Amino acid sequence: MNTPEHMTAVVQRYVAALNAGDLDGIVALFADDATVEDPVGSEPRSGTAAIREFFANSLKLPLAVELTQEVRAVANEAAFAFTVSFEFQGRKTVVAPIDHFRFNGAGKVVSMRALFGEKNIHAGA
Amino acid sequence: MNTPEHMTAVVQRYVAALNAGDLDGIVALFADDATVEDPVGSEPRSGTAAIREFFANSLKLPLAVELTQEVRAVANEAAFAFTVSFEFQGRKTVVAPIDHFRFNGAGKVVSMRALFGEKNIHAGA
Numbered sequence: 001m002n003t004p005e006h007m008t009a010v011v012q013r014y015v016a017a018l019n020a021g022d023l024d025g026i027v028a029l030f031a032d033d034a035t036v037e038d039p040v041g042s043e044p045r046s047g048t049a050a051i052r053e054f055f056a057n058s059l060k061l062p063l064a065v066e067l068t069q070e071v072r073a074v075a076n077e078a079a080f081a082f083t084v085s086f087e088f089q090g091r092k093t094v095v096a097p098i099d100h101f102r103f104n105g106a107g108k109v110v111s112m113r114a115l116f117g118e119k120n121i122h123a124g125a
Numbered sequence: 126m127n128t129p130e131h132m133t134a135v136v137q138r139y140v141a142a143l144n145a146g147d148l149d150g151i152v153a154l155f156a157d158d159a160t161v162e163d164p165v166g167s168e169p170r171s172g173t174a175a176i177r178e179f180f181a182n183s184l185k186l187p188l189a190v191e192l193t194q195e196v197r198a199v200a201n202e203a204a205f206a207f208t209v210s211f212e213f214q215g216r217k218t219v220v221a222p223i224d225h226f227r228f229n230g231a232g233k234v235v236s237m238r239a240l241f242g243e244k245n246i247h248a249g250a
């Protein structure tokens with residue numbers, strides 16, 4: 001139950017800001033102090049300065065964000081994945097990680113997680 | 126930077142017990158009191174009588190479990206997905222959810238999560 005369309009909107013805008021590298025929109029979609037678990041087995045960063053200081057550090061990498069499968073959203077939380085098509089200084093590498101989500105009931109984004117690894121990455125020519 | 130071969134092994138055995146509907150290999154792969162989380166709304170099950178009583182009740186439904194994509198395993202945790210092909214009161218329904226994993230080293234399992242929803246299900250012909 002629970003229209004997953006609302007939880008999916010956060011994922012859209014969440015990435016729409018990624019694709020456009022508009023952190024301002026990410027922090028916007030991120031509660032005043034939402035929590036983000038990343039990297040894995042690492043330490044999250046709660047707060048707008050943290051969520052941004054974090055998501056911002058991720059934007060420092062000029063890549064392309066474009067989902068590929070179907071976003072997942074259940075209960076007040078949610079989970080989705082995408083691919084990062086960045087470029088190197090002579091080669092082109094892409095990645096295929098996934099992200100988690102933690103809302104509070106149509107009240108913007110509260111917490112968030114991120115899953116991936118050197119196996120969900122890519123290395124082609 | 127870690128070898129997911131060990132963690133992924135849990136996902137294998139974890140499902141090998143599923144494919145064989147052997148709750149034993151499941152609880153076996155599960156610590157003496159691992160932690161579960163399902164379906165999606167604060168419904169975990171710690172201990173063995175709970176993890177098994179759960180993973181067992183899940184086996185009560187006759188379906189087919191056979192991963193197809195790539196399992197995910199990072200740090201001491203991990204995440205994977207697959208598809209479920211079971212039958213209904215007359216038609217055949219399949220399912221495409223994703224599960225999570227929480228280990229404590231590389232010998233057995235301790236905690237585990239799950240993700241999906243009515244969108245990751247499969248109803249039709």
Ligand SMILES: C[C@]12CC[C@H]3[C@@H](CCC4=CC(=O)CC[C@@H]43)[C@@H]1CC[C@H]2OC(=O)CCC(=O)O
Pocket residue numbers: 038039057058059061084086093095098099114
């Ligand atoms: C900083 C980083 C780009 C930004 C992402 C970060 C991993 C965690 C993360 C999760 C998100 O949902 C936003 C992107 C950020 C990545 C880890 C490495 C990196 O970029 C790469 O993928 C490196 C690829 C390479 O070296 O080939």
Ligand SMILES: C[C@]12CC[C@H]3[C@@H](CCC4=CC(=O)CC[C@@H]43)[C@@H]1CC[C@H]2OC(=O)CCC(=O)O
Pocket residue numbers: 163164182183184186209218220224239246
């Ligand atoms: C109990 C349950 C079967 C067991 C799984 C549970 C969802 C959570 C779950 C995650 C796992 O990794 C083990 C299976 C359990 C399912 C939710 C519904 C159900 O079975 C169905 O898929 C119902 C399909 C239908 O009739 O539409």
